[PDB]
Design a protein around this ligand. Structure first.
Ligand SMILES: Cn1cnc(Cn2c(=O)nc(Nc3cc4cn(C)nc4cc3Cl)n(Cc3cc(F)c(F)cc3F)c2=O)n1
Ligand SMILES: Cn1cnc(Cn2c(=O)nc(Nc3cc4cn(C)nc4cc3Cl)n(Cc3cc(F)c(F)cc3F)c2=O)n1
Lengths: 298, 298
């Protein structure tokens, strides 16, 4: 098993460049609106402690250079929604897919189309960490790149990239401009909270192991969810939610292994280690494959 | 530092479904020609031991059903080039990108657009193994999926997927229909030669590790190129050539770590193991990033 991204074509056709003065980043063109980080309105001297309200009042439509490739899109309206700028343009994007805006939970995965100057450059799968960062791969110029899932030709946009943190992890917003985590769009040092292991995804990976016949870790025990959650936190593992139990349903049904029985097998692995035995050819327990990812690849 | 694929939109626009009787798989539609594995002309019985020239002479254009999404493309000519069938259709693909067909060499990487019944499903990065297999992620229905690289809006197609071997690795052809490796397009158990590790790629990845702050494996030991290659060969690593050393030049300059100095680090890793430590989060030495892949991502 390896990480696989969604085909990126439906998002590639929406990527544009947005420039304000010399400040430049990526934007997302859906119907007749371009969405982008409001940080674009900052000059170099504004980036440290921007007053976005004061910065926006000084701007008019004609101060925004929006380009699809070399082709300018004329801006006919602008507004700010939390940390995203919405630029109304005079042309509806003919490549607009069916889409929605969603806000994801930690542990959920998504594909990232990394872009530079409005030009798509690469695609890879990412997971939202419990500390609301993502361990992405981004260079300078990537601000405004988006993350997404595709379900039955509908693109669910979930992430817009804003910044890199001092630890090298990445932070951003949903497409309504609300940050994941306790971050602000200022060029100031912001540390991520202490991270934890995504339990629901480790469990998904154990189910993937069982589906593939690697099942030595299945023990003869069960547990309650509450008991498991209390032990999990002692090992820096996330507690499971009721939604987590439910999204493990399909894998539990496919394998005949009750979710709480798998929890008991994982608890044994936390309290005793793996004894130099491997699971799916890996000595480490993978935590960036969701239950949906497992059924998708198997 | 992530495994990163090229944006797949230019290739998505070219995927179609090809069917002959009950047999169906993916094709690549460029201008007025659809390219697909010639295995599509086999019945269940033919697959086990096909005489392809015999099977093809017994086919007419009307025996080929090509579907592009909802629309059927009329076949007006057909021919065979090695293991690839070329179907002339009465319609040019308006989404045809600038493209070339290239045959890649062991160790080089490419993006795979995995498709099922003509519909793109996922994108990920692969390497051509020294034994001319690829460790892909492919399911039933993926026959005809292609691998590619993109340079300045030109798609270089390098791989067309044919089959999964008993070990779970994958085998295929270039777009002229010539297999990579000693395989044949027949449904019979086929083994590959013993694989080796792509040394220049391991070194590139070690540089990626240093660039991203992971330095524990460095040492003050030295080695000559020949003495490194003696140890590498002992451990079933491919030889490192002076061309490889030259290609690693930019990463040596960026990090200030001489190539032969990084060879001395790798030598110790081969001889001592990783002592339970990880590099870029991996417990094993990763060999599917080329030097160009590392430079581009870093
Ligand atoms: C290495 N890396 C990894 N991810 C990132 C993302 N990123 C970015 O692409 N750009 C940023 N600052 C800008 C500088 C500009 C210079 N010009 C001429 N134009 C520019 C546009 C931008 Cl956005 N930043 C920093 C950053 C961006 C924010 F949106 C924010 F709220 C705070 C920040 F500190 C950045 O992280 N780079
Ligand atoms: C698990 N897996 C991973 N990769 C693959 C690729 N693959 C494939 O997709 N299909 C194959 N056989 C077919 C059966 C069909 C049944 N119908 C109704 N239509 C079919 C079409 C195909 Cl192609 N194979 C097997 C295979 C395909 C070849 F092209 C070949 F030369 C030898 C082979 F043994 C397959 O490997 N499956």
């Amino acid at each position: 098993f390896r990480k696989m991204a969604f085909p990126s074509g439906k998002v590639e056709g929406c990527m544009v460049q947005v420039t304000c003065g010399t400040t430049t980043l990526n934007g997302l063109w859906l119907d007749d609106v371009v969405y982008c980080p409001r940080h674009v309105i900052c000059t170099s001297e504004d980036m440290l402690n921007p007053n976005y309200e004061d910065l926006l009042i000084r701007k008019s439509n004609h101060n925004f250079l929006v380009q699809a490739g070399n082709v300018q899109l004329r801006v006919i309206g602008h507004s700010m929604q939390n940390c995203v700028l919405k630029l109304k343009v005079d042309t509806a994007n003919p490549k607009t897919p069916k889409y929605k805006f969603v806000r994801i939970q930690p542990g959920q995965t998504f594909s990232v189309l990394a872009c530079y100057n409005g030009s798509p450059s690469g695609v890879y799968q990412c997971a939202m960490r419990p500390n609301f960062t993502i361990k992405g791969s981004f260079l300078n110029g990537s601000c405004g790149s988006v993350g997404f899932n595709i379900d039955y030709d509908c693109v669910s946009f979930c992430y817009m990239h804003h910044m890199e943190l001092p630890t090298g992890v990445h932070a951003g917003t949903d497409l309504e401009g609300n940050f994941y985590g306790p971050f602000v769009d200022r060029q100031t040092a912001q540390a991520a909270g202490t991270d934890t292991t995504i339990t629901v995804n480790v469990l998904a990976w154990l189910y993937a192991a069982v589906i593939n016949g690697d099942r030595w870790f299945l023990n003869r025990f069960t547990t309650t969810l509450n008991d498991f959650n209390l032990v999990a936190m002692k090992y820096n593992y996330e507690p499971l939610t009721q939604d987590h139990v439910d999204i493990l349903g399909p894998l539990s049904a496919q394998t005949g292994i009750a979710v709480l029985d798998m929890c008991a097998s994982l608890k044994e692995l936390l309290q005793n280690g793996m004894n130099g035995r491997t699971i799916l050819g890996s000595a480490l327990l993978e935590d960036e494959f969701t239950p949906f990812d497992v059924v998708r690849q198997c």
